[PDB]
Amino acid sequence: DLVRVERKGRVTTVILNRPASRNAVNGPTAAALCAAFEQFDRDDAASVAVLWGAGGTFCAGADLKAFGTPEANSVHRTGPGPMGPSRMMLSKPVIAAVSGYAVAGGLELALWCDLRVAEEDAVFGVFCRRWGVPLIDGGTVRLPRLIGHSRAMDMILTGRGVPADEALAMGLANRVVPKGQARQAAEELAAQLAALPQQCLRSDRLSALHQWGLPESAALDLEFASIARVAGEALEGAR
Amino acid sequence: DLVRVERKGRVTTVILNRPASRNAVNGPTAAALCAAFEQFDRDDAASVAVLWGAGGTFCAGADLKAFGTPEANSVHRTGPGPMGPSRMMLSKPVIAAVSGYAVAGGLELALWCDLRVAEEDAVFGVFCRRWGVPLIDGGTVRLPRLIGHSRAMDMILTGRGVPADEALAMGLANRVVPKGQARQAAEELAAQLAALPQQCLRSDRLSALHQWGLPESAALDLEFASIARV
Amino acid sequence: DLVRVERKGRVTTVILNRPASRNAVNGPTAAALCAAFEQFDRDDAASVAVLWGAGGTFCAGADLKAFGTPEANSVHRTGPGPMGPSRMMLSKPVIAAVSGYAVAGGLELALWCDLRVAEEDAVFGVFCRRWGVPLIDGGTVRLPRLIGHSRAMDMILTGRGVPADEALAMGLANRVVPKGQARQAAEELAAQLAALPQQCLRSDRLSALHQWGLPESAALDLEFASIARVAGEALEGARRF
């Protein structure tokens, strides 16, 4: 069907499965992506998710051929974003395992992930620039935060394909692995993260995400709450 | 004569034209840059601008010799900044075509631009650090956003010259081209941008600018107005 | 003594001096670090500070062995942070001179400094990730602003050690120097900073710090106040051309 979910211990892999359309995401696919990540989020046995496109490419963005059919992307001010989970701030991390193209709304999904493991011949890019479809799944918010305003404006204005090696030098890809290996390497990294003390990891991440836009004083006070949140685990740390 | 404007289709090139003062910007030059950008912003036939300094150099900053004279930079809390257009948020992008030095206020004009195409030989730097004149044309605001706080603080505190290759690795230069090619490479990049669908390009650009200083959720709310506009 | 303070010209060096604990910071160490920096902030004879760990390593973070002793770190929502000066906004810059490990709370002290000079074999890392102790001295705030969110999230999630050369490529280290030379190289760079016109330098720096979080138009207004703060120096600067 459209999205598959697989689990191995505390790692959940969410798989986009529309290879005939280069994993473009239409309305029902966006809903299945949301359902999958909502379930991951409430599942206390799952610690880390991996997002992966089956078929050799990650995600080509919104399914243009579905424009004005009943399968079109949902576009509303509240509820899920058009690409599915792009507005959610999950309680636990997601690693993107990027093969082939992560472009347009597919780039937005990769940016919504906490880390990106890219294959050597992967390409990241704002390819919706060529066809006049806007970034409305957070790309204009997240890209500049991730890699700095200058590099981000370069990608956003030109729409150019950034290859994996350049993405690694920009900090857009966090790891670059051989062709075919992103899923496995993402899943290995995920399992490593799952084996660390979880409350503290989780609270640190959400502090990193929430600090953007905040003044330092407030961001420091948000962060400080971690010690009360994880106090159980931090006790077991001093030991 | 202080500033020339040349058009090629939907690309307007604004040219700083005081090579004998290393393209330092005094009060009248700043006013002329403002007027040229105001006109570009209002011009429905112009899509992308290029900012380029004639005669081998981009801009060495404020014309400090003009201080105390009627040609002195105007320094006021509102209206144009001292270098000219550095407080404007344009509806459309500008590419800086950097040769030679982009220093002090000249670095601030380059940071105000959306993209920077630099020549191999070009140097970027906070050289006003050495002279004891403050950055008040957005350098302290824009540089950390462009390349991160750590690198920006190195540049700002030290005032060191950053050559084009280092600038490209920091993300400060977007493109590096051979000596004398900055104008042409910028104009070519501009024409490529002018050939894409424009409403969506301009919308995405403004959203990337405004998100800084909104937290995530509010910034996502704001970007979602692009759906309305275009 | 837990912390030593030495003055060389206009450069004050604050020295973490517990090499047998890998320069872990307990309660009384943190209090001595705050006092050293508060004294710096008000000393008109000092322009720039350097923070340096003695004995081969920068700082291993909070002193976990001291939890439940009278020397435990003070952990309170207001006032000084648990590592000591990590919530202070100083009026003057501080350069971290990193040898060996700057990890956990030690990384956070290095992040709190304006610039980092690292030895070629130094390592930066969120090592508290392994022990399950949270970052509460500003690491989750400052790391993303310093190096971007993607690279910061890598370091924060994994807890991996980032060697000096990779740290230089990420923008986390600003300078990389040979083994044994962090202190001297940081002090030399500090003396360079101290030789520049100090009012513009200090205002530019604070504008760069306060702009984070602000829309550009308000941030430009804050920056514009520099000209009133530094008018005497800027007038002198103008008159030399």
XYZ file of C-alpha atoms in Angstrom:
710
model
C 0.000 0.000 0.000
C 1.203 3.661 0.422
C 3.225 3.650 3.675
C 4.607 0.686 5.552
C 5.729 0.519 9.108
C 8.359 -1.953 10.352
C 9.814 -2.368 13.835
C 12.899 -3.890 15.171
C 13.187 -3.457 18.969
C 12.810 0.187 19.773
C 13.317 1.458 16.190
C 10.401 2.105 13.868
C 10.942 2.536 10.198
C 8.255 4.390 8.246
C 8.485 3.582 4.566
C 7.109 5.540 1.690
C 5.980 3.064 -1.020
C 4.970 4.804 -4.231
C 7.877 4.055 -6.462
C 5.990 4.573 -9.715
C 5.540 8.229 -8.743
C 9.043 8.649 -7.232
C 7.361 8.582 -3.817
C 5.394 11.682 -4.380
C 2.932 12.254 -1.574
C -0.796 12.691 -2.270
C -3.574 13.217 0.202
C -4.063 9.585 1.283
C -0.305 9.077 1.507
C 0.033 12.199 3.714
C -2.662 10.847 5.977
C -0.968 7.472 6.253
C 2.374 9.241 7.080
C 0.581 11.154 9.845
C -1.060 8.128 11.201
C 2.281 6.309 11.274
C 4.137 9.073 13.098
C 1.200 9.670 15.514
C 1.334 6.035 16.407
C 5.175 6.168 16.823
C 4.800 9.153 19.039
C 2.376 7.415 21.524
C 4.159 4.009 21.388
C 6.212 3.675 24.575
C 8.090 0.688 23.187
C 9.388 2.798 20.190
C 12.305 5.196 20.857
C 13.559 6.352 17.464
C 12.034 6.379 13.994
C 13.612 6.157 10.561
C 11.952 7.689 7.563
C 12.829 5.991 4.211
C 11.618 5.980 0.630
C 11.539 2.544 -0.976
C 12.452 2.139 -4.627
C 15.651 4.145 -4.810
C 14.449 7.633 -4.076
C 13.246 9.356 -0.904
C 10.440 11.626 -1.910
C 9.650 13.850 -4.891
C 7.206 16.124 -3.040
C 3.526 16.654 -3.548
C 1.795 14.496 -6.121
C 1.156 17.116 -8.854
C -0.915 14.672 -10.995
C -3.388 14.462 -8.122
C -4.104 18.264 -8.187
C -7.869 18.709 -8.227
C -8.880 15.065 -7.901
C -10.294 13.573 -4.690
C -6.734 12.285 -3.836
C -5.229 15.861 -3.765
C -3.070 17.087 -0.869
C -5.091 18.671 1.977
C -4.172 22.343 2.433
C -5.621 23.916 5.631
C -4.458 26.356 8.270
C -4.707 23.764 11.066
C -4.388 19.979 11.260
C -1.643 18.170 9.268
C 0.477 19.987 6.717
C 0.154 19.038 3.029
C 3.044 16.536 3.087
C 1.593 14.871 6.242
C 3.648 15.138 9.459
C 5.652 18.307 8.594
C 3.908 20.398 11.334
C 4.289 17.900 14.072
C 6.908 18.247 16.733
C 7.331 14.716 17.862
C 8.407 13.767 21.268
C 11.174 11.452 19.956
C 13.682 11.722 17.114
C 13.307 10.692 13.434
C 16.285 9.988 11.133
C 15.817 10.514 7.376
C 17.474 7.742 5.232
C 17.807 9.545 2.032
C 18.399 7.686 -1.298
C 18.022 9.303 -4.715
C 16.008 12.528 -4.705
C 14.752 14.447 -1.635
C 13.138 17.338 -3.443
C 10.443 19.927 -2.963
C 8.038 18.648 -0.306
C 10.387 15.629 -0.029
C 13.191 17.992 0.944
C 10.778 19.420 3.587
C 10.225 16.009 5.014
C 13.944 15.413 5.216
C 14.431 18.763 6.968
C 11.621 17.937 9.482
C 13.753 14.899 10.465
C 16.329 15.402 13.154
C 19.218 13.863 11.197
C 19.787 13.003 7.560
C 21.860 10.021 6.389
C 22.323 10.397 2.707
C 23.597 7.990 0.008
C 26.587 9.208 -2.063
C 24.478 9.982 -5.106
C 21.545 11.544 -3.293
C 20.351 14.948 -4.318
C 18.568 17.560 -2.102
C 16.711 20.469 -3.728
C 13.865 22.867 -3.837
C 12.604 21.593 -7.229
C 9.133 23.112 -6.715
C 10.828 26.364 -7.743
C 10.757 25.156 -11.396
C 7.022 24.657 -11.330
C 5.836 27.500 -9.098
C 4.492 25.472 -6.150
C 5.317 27.145 -2.793
C 7.175 25.722 0.220
C 4.408 25.275 2.792
C 5.733 22.332 4.741
C 8.353 24.242 6.660
C 11.165 24.399 4.239
C 11.572 28.165 4.483
C 11.607 27.929 8.233
C 13.843 24.929 8.718
C 16.409 25.226 5.953
C 17.870 28.538 7.141
C 18.027 27.218 10.716
C 19.731 24.068 9.626
C 22.447 25.437 7.360
C 22.400 29.240 7.738
C 20.482 31.855 5.811
C 23.025 32.235 2.977
C 23.113 28.618 1.875
C 19.464 28.292 2.416
C 18.633 31.288 0.138
C 20.915 29.791 -2.529
C 18.856 26.575 -2.483
C 15.552 28.279 -2.153
C 16.004 30.921 -4.901
C 17.781 28.718 -7.525
C 15.997 25.431 -6.907
C 19.289 23.721 -7.712
C 20.146 20.079 -6.868
C 22.645 19.897 -4.099
C 24.547 16.593 -4.249
C 25.337 14.566 -1.143
C 28.957 15.589 -0.859
C 28.101 19.280 -1.061
C 25.233 18.638 1.404
C 27.612 17.097 3.795
C 29.954 20.124 3.585
C 26.984 22.488 4.185
C 25.777 20.442 7.179
C 22.578 19.516 5.401
C 23.514 15.776 5.344
C 24.869 14.530 8.608
C 26.336 11.253 7.246
C 27.064 10.139 3.677
C 27.084 6.384 3.048
C 27.290 4.163 -0.110
C 24.438 3.774 -2.512
C 21.852 1.501 -1.062
C 23.082 1.712 2.479
C 21.161 4.742 3.915
C 18.392 2.667 5.396
C 20.692 0.329 7.184
C 23.044 3.017 8.378
C 20.075 5.145 9.612
C 18.682 2.176 11.425
C 22.044 1.444 13.033
C 22.325 5.049 14.177
C 18.770 4.835 15.460
C 19.547 1.758 17.510
C 22.601 3.477 18.957
C 20.374 6.356 20.026
C 17.824 3.920 21.481
C 20.412 2.325 23.665
C 21.331 5.727 25.389
C 19.336 7.209 28.489
C 16.174 8.263 26.849
C 14.568 11.007 28.963
C 17.564 13.143 28.896
C 18.076 12.705 25.146
C 14.529 13.563 24.511
C 14.442 16.658 26.714
C 17.713 17.994 25.228
C 16.408 17.620 21.748
C 13.173 19.391 22.420
C 15.076 22.215 24.097
C 17.221 22.583 20.905
C 14.139 22.737 18.805
C 12.196 25.172 20.990
C 15.033 27.634 21.530
C 14.840 28.973 17.990
C 12.979 32.392 18.110
C 13.361 32.693 21.812
C 15.567 35.065 23.651
C 18.365 33.488 25.410
C 16.921 34.068 28.899
C 13.749 32.284 28.168
C 15.503 29.527 26.107
C 17.813 28.981 29.065
C 14.849 28.713 31.420
C 13.016 26.293 29.068
C 16.168 24.129 28.985
C 16.538 24.161 32.725
C 13.297 22.299 33.154
C 15.127 19.213 31.892
C 16.656 18.634 35.241
C 13.160 18.265 36.874
C 11.857 16.256 33.950
C 14.614 13.673 33.947
C 15.545 13.824 37.643
C 14.935 9.971 38.003
C 17.445 9.180 35.227
C 20.035 11.904 36.267
C 20.105 10.226 39.818
C 20.999 6.872 38.085
C 23.737 8.914 36.219
C 25.591 10.201 39.383
C 25.682 6.583 40.716
C 27.377 59.381 -12.118
C 27.839 58.290 -8.394
C 25.622 55.307 -9.137
C 24.645 53.974 -12.581
C 21.744 51.688 -13.341
C 21.731 49.363 -16.402
C 18.938 46.996 -17.442
C 19.010 43.761 -19.518
C 15.528 42.378 -19.806
C 14.219 41.655 -16.349
C 17.645 42.187 -14.623
C 18.651 45.580 -13.276
C 22.227 46.141 -12.438
C 22.985 48.828 -9.932
C 26.517 50.001 -10.170
C 28.554 51.791 -7.642
C 30.813 54.079 -9.561
C 33.397 55.834 -7.427
C 36.459 53.661 -8.190
C 38.788 56.476 -7.173
C 37.424 56.269 -3.499
C 37.424 52.391 -3.554
C 33.667 52.781 -3.979
C 33.215 54.316 -0.556
C 29.617 55.512 -0.107
C 29.119 59.095 1.052
C 25.718 60.753 1.696
C 24.804 61.436 -1.904
C 25.923 58.006 -3.090
C 23.756 56.419 -0.364
C 20.807 58.450 -1.477
C 21.360 57.450 -5.081
C 21.510 53.679 -4.069
C 18.290 54.045 -2.225
C 16.600 55.694 -5.169
C 17.846 52.975 -7.535
C 16.543 50.213 -5.237
C 13.252 51.986 -4.575
C 12.743 52.202 -8.310
C 13.653 48.467 -8.771
C 11.261 47.436 -6.042
C 8.353 49.368 -7.723
C 9.267 48.392 -11.304
C 6.917 45.552 -12.492
C 9.257 44.924 -15.444
C 12.295 44.213 -13.165
C 12.591 40.799 -11.488
C 16.142 40.537 -10.011
C 18.855 43.100 -9.261
C 22.590 42.846 -9.185
C 24.718 45.125 -7.109
C 28.206 45.634 -8.466
C 31.049 47.959 -7.783
C 32.902 49.277 -10.877
C 36.659 49.425 -11.272
C 37.914 46.305 -9.520
C 36.348 46.658 -6.064
C 32.871 46.301 -4.461
C 32.659 48.813 -1.621
C 34.974 49.927 1.148
C 32.203 51.245 3.409
C 31.237 54.724 4.488
C 33.240 57.605 3.075
C 34.833 58.682 6.273
C 36.748 61.594 4.533
C 33.318 63.119 3.809
C 32.693 63.385 7.557
C 32.034 66.978 8.637
C 31.266 68.029 5.046
C 27.909 68.478 3.365
C 28.506 65.108 1.599
C 28.713 63.191 4.962
C 26.657 59.985 5.427
C 23.270 60.603 7.022
C 22.998 58.798 10.356
C 19.436 58.681 11.654
C 17.293 56.318 13.680
C 14.700 56.016 10.906
C 14.599 56.485 7.147
C 17.547 55.053 5.127
C 20.577 53.597 6.833
C 23.992 55.291 6.422
C 25.034 53.057 3.504
C 21.731 53.560 1.723
C 19.435 50.563 1.237
C 20.571 48.391 4.164
C 17.292 48.771 6.083
C 15.077 47.923 3.164
C 13.410 44.631 2.830
C 12.846 44.434 -0.960
C 9.965 42.476 -2.514
C 12.529 40.982 -4.953
C 16.074 39.578 -4.690
C 19.441 41.171 -5.181
C 22.695 39.465 -6.056
C 25.920 41.036 -4.976
C 28.776 40.806 -7.562
C 31.826 41.180 -5.427
C 35.280 41.980 -6.723
C 38.144 43.236 -4.673
C 37.141 44.380 -1.159
C 33.693 44.178 0.447
C 34.580 45.650 3.750
C 32.996 47.543 6.646
C 29.791 49.105 5.346
C 30.586 47.481 2.035
C 30.418 44.039 3.696
C 27.060 45.116 5.137
C 25.736 45.896 1.688
C 26.926 42.529 0.501
C 25.183 40.766 3.450
C 22.022 42.643 2.703
C 21.968 41.057 -0.670
C 20.355 37.679 -1.105
C 23.361 35.987 -2.683
C 26.959 36.865 -3.084
C 29.100 35.945 -6.174
C 32.666 36.694 -5.403
C 35.837 36.733 -7.522
C 38.705 34.427 -6.466
C 40.734 37.391 -5.415
C 37.871 39.066 -3.292
C 38.116 39.799 0.395
C 35.196 40.244 2.910
C 35.887 41.801 6.299
C 34.698 43.902 9.226
C 37.476 46.448 8.641
C 35.651 49.146 10.595
C 36.823 47.195 13.612
C 40.287 48.574 13.033
C 39.113 52.260 12.630
C 36.607 52.288 15.618
C 33.347 52.909 13.663
C 30.397 50.702 14.480
C 28.464 48.283 12.341
C 25.039 50.052 12.009
C 23.979 48.843 8.598
C 22.884 45.346 9.748
C 26.181 43.473 9.879
C 25.704 42.375 13.475
C 22.207 41.207 12.624
C 22.792 39.590 9.315
C 26.214 37.910 9.645
C 25.212 35.537 12.450
C 22.156 34.553 10.565
C 24.088 33.978 7.355
C 26.997 31.822 8.701
C 26.211 31.076 12.332
C 27.191 32.795 15.463
C 30.667 31.278 15.935
C 32.017 32.317 12.534
C 30.274 35.656 12.670
C 31.782 36.406 16.072
C 35.276 35.584 14.691
C 34.746 38.017 11.827
C 33.158 40.694 13.997
C 35.551 40.646 16.847
C 38.824 40.287 14.852
C 37.918 42.365 11.857
C 40.088 39.991 9.763
C 39.906 39.733 6.006
C 38.265 36.590 4.821
C 39.340 35.544 1.304
C 36.912 34.210 -1.170
C 37.767 30.527 -0.782
C 37.347 30.667 3.007
C 34.114 32.668 2.445
C 32.818 29.979 0.174
C 33.558 27.257 2.776
C 31.799 29.365 5.539
C 28.828 29.942 3.304
C 29.430 33.679 3.157
C 30.164 33.515 -0.642
C 27.601 31.546 -2.575
C 29.721 31.312 -5.779
C 33.374 31.912 -6.493
C 34.372 32.875 -10.076
C 37.600 34.044 -11.731
C 38.927 37.626 -11.545
C 36.749 40.084 -13.507
C 33.873 37.611 -13.897
C 31.664 38.640 -10.904
C 29.384 40.937 -12.834
C 28.786 38.570 -15.651
C 28.305 35.517 -13.423
C 25.869 37.482 -11.229
C 23.946 38.745 -14.187
C 23.722 35.209 -15.588
C 22.499 33.870 -12.239
C 20.008 36.736 -12.088
C 18.598 35.928 -15.525
C 18.152 32.296 -14.454
C 16.188 33.470 -11.452
C 14.174 35.843 -13.646
C 13.201 32.946 -15.857
C 11.490 30.914 -12.944
C 7.867 31.321 -11.667
C 8.094 34.574 -9.761
C 5.306 34.731 -7.214
C 6.354 31.579 -5.560
C 10.078 32.523 -5.586
C 9.359 35.885 -3.933
C 7.010 34.443 -1.444
C 9.477 31.699 -0.337
C 12.210 34.338 -0.080
C 10.170 36.645 2.242
C 9.180 33.712 4.403
C 12.877 32.719 4.829
C 13.632 36.318 5.890
C 10.698 36.689 8.359
C 11.046 33.352 10.064
C 14.192 34.478 11.862
C 12.847 35.756 15.152
C 9.665 33.750 15.175
C 9.624 30.460 17.050
C 8.843 27.405 14.966
C 5.078 27.138 15.231
C 4.476 30.802 14.529
C 6.914 30.745 11.661
C 5.178 27.729 10.084
C 1.831 29.695 10.453
C 3.345 32.585 8.686
C 4.831 30.560 5.792
C 1.412 28.996 5.200
C 0.172 32.480 3.883
C 2.251 31.775 0.686
C -0.643 29.387 -0.289
C -2.952 32.532 -0.429
C -0.519 34.965 -2.185
C 0.575 32.901 -5.259
C 43.028 26.493 44.831
C 40.148 25.409 42.500
C 40.338 28.392 40.156
C 43.327 30.711 39.637
C 43.187 34.080 38.018
C 46.298 35.518 36.224
C 46.595 38.882 34.537
C 48.912 39.517 31.549
C 48.560 43.000 30.063
C 44.896 43.579 29.395
C 44.116 39.855 29.333
C 42.755 38.002 32.280
C 43.119 34.249 32.294
C 40.754 32.204 34.418
C 42.238 28.849 35.098
C 40.368 25.707 36.046
C 42.820 23.880 38.276
C 41.535 20.375 39.172
C 43.485 18.182 36.763
C 43.062 15.089 38.970
C 39.266 15.354 38.458
C 39.744 16.231 34.716
C 38.749 19.749 35.638
C 35.232 18.756 36.631
C 33.352 21.605 38.218
C 31.753 21.180 41.618
C 29.843 23.779 43.666
C 32.783 25.711 45.092
C 34.557 25.635 41.699
C 31.503 27.079 40.020
C 31.271 29.806 42.644
C 34.951 30.671 42.144
C 34.411 30.824 38.345
C 31.517 33.182 38.810
C 33.495 35.396 41.125
C 36.441 35.503 38.684
C 34.231 36.557 35.809
C 32.202 39.063 37.831
C 35.476 40.671 38.889
C 36.632 40.672 35.209
C 33.407 42.259 34.015
C 34.025 45.297 36.310
C 37.834 45.544 36.002
C 38.594 48.508 33.734
C 42.215 47.322 33.427
C 41.045 44.007 31.732
C 39.680 43.944 28.188
C 39.446 40.262 27.267
C 39.438 37.066 29.173
C 40.653 33.578 28.448
C 39.231 30.457 30.041
C 41.697 27.631 30.303
C 41.907 24.200 32.015
C 45.261 23.320 33.642
C 47.031 20.027 33.277
C 46.095 18.930 29.811
C 42.317 19.089 29.648
C 39.684 21.852 29.463
C 36.737 20.627 31.507
C 34.809 17.364 31.946
C 31.610 19.068 33.090
C 29.894 18.812 36.446
C 31.537 16.856 39.225
C 29.233 13.841 39.524
C 31.226 12.311 42.447
C 30.232 15.389 44.508
C 26.441 14.824 44.161
C 25.067 14.480 47.692
C 28.079 16.050 49.401
C 28.288 19.651 50.610
C 30.458 20.306 47.444
C 27.664 19.400 45.028
C 26.805 21.702 42.165
C 24.081 24.227 42.980
C 21.226 23.693 40.674
C 18.681 26.522 40.702
C 16.527 28.107 38.211
C 17.791 31.664 38.789
C 21.039 33.161 39.817
C 24.320 31.404 38.600
C 23.949 28.188 36.526
C 25.356 24.921 37.801
C 28.723 25.289 35.890
C 29.094 28.852 37.288
C 29.160 31.653 34.641
C 27.077 30.028 31.933
C 24.145 32.423 32.347
C 26.216 35.591 32.494
C 26.183 38.042 29.643
C 29.588 39.827 30.058
C 30.385 43.204 28.682
C 33.700 41.891 27.268
C 34.684 38.825 25.317
C 36.053 35.578 26.631
C 38.148 33.071 24.563
C 38.087 29.429 25.442
C 41.574 27.822 25.217
C 40.656 24.179 24.863
C 43.145 21.336 25.384
C 42.144 17.632 25.820
C 38.396 17.272 26.448
C 35.686 19.959 26.509
C 32.778 17.694 27.202
C 29.326 17.810 28.869
C 29.207 21.012 31.021
C 32.705 21.745 29.846
C 31.493 21.933 26.288
C 28.842 24.282 27.576
C 31.456 26.583 29.101
C 33.348 26.523 25.789
C 30.130 27.433 23.988
C 29.482 30.314 26.353
C 32.816 31.828 25.352
C 32.897 34.090 22.308
C 35.677 32.175 20.497
C 37.261 28.750 20.884
C 40.997 28.030 20.278
C 41.490 24.270 20.311
C 44.604 22.102 20.323
C 44.971 19.747 17.374
C 44.150 16.768 19.544
C 41.231 18.295 21.565
C 37.759 16.734 21.546
C 34.369 18.491 22.009
C 31.356 16.499 22.892
C 28.029 16.083 24.668
C 29.378 13.188 26.787
C 26.647 13.615 29.412
C 24.424 11.928 26.818
C 26.063 8.607 27.855
C 25.431 9.042 31.650
C 21.949 10.488 31.273
C 22.662 13.990 32.743
C 20.878 16.783 30.832
C 22.428 19.829 29.319
C 21.317 22.732 31.534
C 24.121 25.267 31.068
C 22.923 26.549 27.766
C 24.312 23.893 25.334
C 20.972 23.247 23.677
C 20.549 26.984 23.171
C 24.004 27.975 22.114
C 25.118 25.004 19.965
C 22.440 25.399 17.336
C 23.019 29.150 17.097
C 26.785 28.631 16.841
C 26.900 25.875 14.157
C 23.438 25.475 12.851
C 20.700 23.154 13.963
C 21.678 20.120 11.879
C 25.177 19.798 13.127
C 24.147 20.686 16.610
C 21.459 17.969 16.657
C 24.104 15.436 15.540
C 26.294 16.307 18.447
C 23.444 16.548 20.942
C 21.687 13.312 20.026
C 24.755 11.092 19.554
C 27.007 12.468 22.245
C 29.955 11.690 19.960
C 33.345 13.263 20.360
C 34.136 15.776 17.685
C 37.871 16.117 17.113
C 39.434 19.527 16.610
C 39.816 19.303 12.875
C 36.154 18.400 12.311
C 35.259 21.109 14.852
C 37.191 23.661 12.798
C 35.338 22.587 9.602
C 31.925 22.871 11.419
C 32.768 26.357 12.821
C 32.795 25.080 16.414
C 36.514 25.752 16.832
C 37.540 29.046 15.484
C 41.323 28.337 15.570
C 43.272 25.087 15.816
C 46.797 25.170 17.254
C 49.468 22.586 18.184
C 49.361 20.526 21.305
C 50.332 22.539 24.377
C 49.682 25.929 22.712
C 45.960 26.669 23.447
C 46.581 28.952 26.332
C 49.314 30.968 24.705
C 47.591 31.172 21.360
C 44.272 32.322 23.050
C 46.119 34.938 25.071
C 47.836 36.216 22.004
C 44.547 36.481 20.095
C 43.044 38.131 23.202
C 45.822 40.752 23.205
C 44.991 41.463 19.588
C 41.347 42.040 20.507
C 42.398 44.205 23.345
C 44.452 46.432 21.015
C 41.486 47.377 18.829
C 39.075 50.417 19.659
C 37.201 48.758 22.546
C 33.788 50.549 22.462
C 32.862 49.525 18.938
C 34.154 46.060 19.541
C 32.081 45.598 22.706
C 28.869 47.073 21.244
C 29.112 45.052 18.017
C 29.550 41.945 20.035
C 26.505 42.623 22.251
C 24.351 43.508 19.264
C 25.296 40.216 17.672
C 24.236 38.440 20.855
C 20.895 40.305 21.412
C 19.728 40.043 17.829
C 18.988 36.316 18.096
C 15.257 35.869 18.157
C 14.349 39.325 16.754
C 12.801 40.270 13.509
C 15.277 42.127 11.439
C 13.702 45.598 11.770
C 13.800 45.514 15.590
C 17.307 43.995 15.587
C 18.499 46.880 13.374
C 17.111 49.350 15.871
C 19.010 47.681 18.689
C 22.180 47.734 16.599
C 21.700 51.441 15.781
C 22.019 52.349 19.434
C 25.747 51.533 19.074
C 26.290 54.948 17.520
C 25.116 56.711 20.665
C 27.124 54.318 22.876
C 30.326 54.785 20.926
C 29.997 58.377 19.619
C 33.324 59.560 21.175
C 35.243 56.673 19.644
C 33.446 56.904 16.254
C 34.171 60.718 16.086
C 37.910 59.918 16.696
C 37.692 57.122 14.048
C 36.100 59.554 11.528
C 38.760 62.274 12.227
C 41.677 59.873 11.260
C 40.484 59.879 7.494
